[PDB]
Amino acid sequence: THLNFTQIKTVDELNQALVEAKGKPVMLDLYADWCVACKEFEKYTFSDPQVQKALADTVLLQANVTANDAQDVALLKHLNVLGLPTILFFDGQGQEHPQARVTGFMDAETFSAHLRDHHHHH
């Protein structure tokens, strides 16, 4: 099984997705078909009900940079991404918190702990 991502391609598209998500946290997954740890996230981590349920109230975005085309490269540069896998997290105000970035494989337990570490105005 698999998470329900919304694809974005460009910097502009990311920004409008963040505008529409405003009020809910966001996770942006940076993916490529050739990225082994990205496939491992799908196999071991995003497939785990604990992770799925933990992410149920998060807007999930994905950028597929497989081609490394001009738009992909501009997005990666804009986000100061150094390589894959990278997962970024934005709060409900749209602010990215760099300490939350995930830049290597994490199993379900580790990823869930990362996610843990604003609900109904609390």
Side-chain angles (χ1 to χ4, degrees):
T1 57
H2 15 344
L3 295 167
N4 285 307
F5 289 102
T6 296
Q7 306 292 310
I8 64 96
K9 182 65 176 175
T10 65
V11 177
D12 284 9
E13 283 183 19
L14 174 60
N15 283 141
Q16 188 64 26
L18 291 176
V19 155
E20 294 172 12
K22 184 87 112 170
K24 253 180 111 164
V26 176
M27 180 180 98
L28 172 61
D29 181 63
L30 309 182
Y31 168 89
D33 289 332
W34 42 252
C35 171
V36 175
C38 293
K39 298 309 273 171
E40 294 176 320
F41 266 107
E42 295 178 341
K43 181 177 177 72
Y44 296 114
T45 303
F46 296 167
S47 59
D48 196 306
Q50 166 179 26
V51 170
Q52 297 173 343
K53 290 179 185 293
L55 290 173
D57 292 346
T58 303
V59 174
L60 307 181
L61 307 179
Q62 183 167 65
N64 171 18
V65 297
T66 297
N68 204 57
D69 66 32
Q71 288 171 316
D72 298 333
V73 172
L75 179 63
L76 293 168
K77 299 231 142 244
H78 165 74
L79 295 173
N80 205 354
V81 168
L82 302 323
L84 307 189
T86 294
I87 312 174
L88 304 79
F89 293 90
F90 305 77
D91 68 23
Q93 302 298 324
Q95 180 129 103
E96 199 232 323
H97 295 283
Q99 59 265 39
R101 291 184 178 203
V102 175
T103 52
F105 177 75
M106 291 182 171
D107 67 16
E109 169 182 84
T110 302
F111 189 66
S112 298
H114 183 85
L115 293 178
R116 176 169 44 253
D117 297 332
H118 285 129
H119 302 107
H120 288 94
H121 288 7
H122 297 128

